[PDB]
Amino acid sequence: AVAPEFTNRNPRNLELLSVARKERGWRTVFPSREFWHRLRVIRTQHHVEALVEHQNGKVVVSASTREWAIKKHNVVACESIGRVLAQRCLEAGINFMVYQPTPWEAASDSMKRLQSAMTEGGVVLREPQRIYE
């Protein structure tokens, strides 16, 4: 009572199984497309944004100050956005991301506190390699 070959269509299956092929190219171009869940952090005037896009460009989880919710109650806002994003990615299933900021941006205190909060929430930013063979 079983088919000769199984067929799964869940796009997240291969993404979490550490087998989904990445974009090995894009070496000379920045940022690199070799990832599974890129964590893009946008900093604008009066507001801050932190997205978690996909290779195809579909936003899965994100948090913004314009959410008529977190706006109530600027490193504090960045830390709050990071904590909310970590909690949402945890309760949604995401647990691995890749952050590729710029040197002048990586050497900032805001990004340092953001990474600290993300690590405290329980989310690693390394993304294990793709198992071959």
């Binding site: 959410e67 919710a69 977190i70 109530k72 109650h73 504090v76 709050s80 909690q87 309760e91 299933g93």
Partner: protein, 155 residues
């Protein structure tokens, strides 16, 4: 052999002799935003997306709440509390569906379950498996629940 261009080529409407009178990019974030906006365009030749492609009262209340929170000062900005239960309640009561629809589209629920015809969830939902009196295992949109914990009907 030389053929004419079908559509307007890029960098053609700003190729004036007064290049010094222009803005001239002095940073990299602006150039990155411009490149992103350009990539987010249909284009008539090619692209990477070819083969792999009531309110007034609420606004016034929000403004008053923001003004009150700003005047309450807090002094700990120079490093604050910022609770999470209130934020979670607001998200579940306000724009919960906004993110639930995105999650469903990313997981392929509307195109697979309903075979298209996307919608927005109106009334919220809460489900949590009972591993005894406590603790309880919550079933959030996309949580990793084990078959063992799901050995009984949830609440």
């Amino acid at each position: 052999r030389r053929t004419p261009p079908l559509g307007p080529m890029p960098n053609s409407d700003i190729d004036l002799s007064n290049l010094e009178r222009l803005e001239k990019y002095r940073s990299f974030d602006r150039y990155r935003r411009r490149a992103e906006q350009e990539a987010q365009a249909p284009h008539w030749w090619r692209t990477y997306r070819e083969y792999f492609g009531r309110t007034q009262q609420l606004l016034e209340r929000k403004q008053a709440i923001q003004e009150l929170r700003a005047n309450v000062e807090e002094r700990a900005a120079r490093t604050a509390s910022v609770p999470l239960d209130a934020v979670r309640a607001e998200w579940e009561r306000t724009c919960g569906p906004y993110h639930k629809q995105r999650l469903a589209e990313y997981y392929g629920l509307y195109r697979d379950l309903f075979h298209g015809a996307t919608f927005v969830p109106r009334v919220p939902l809460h489900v949590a498996y009972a591993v005894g009196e406590d603790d309880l295992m919550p079933v959030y949109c996309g949580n990793e629940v084990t078959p063992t914990e799901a050995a009984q009907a949830p609440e």
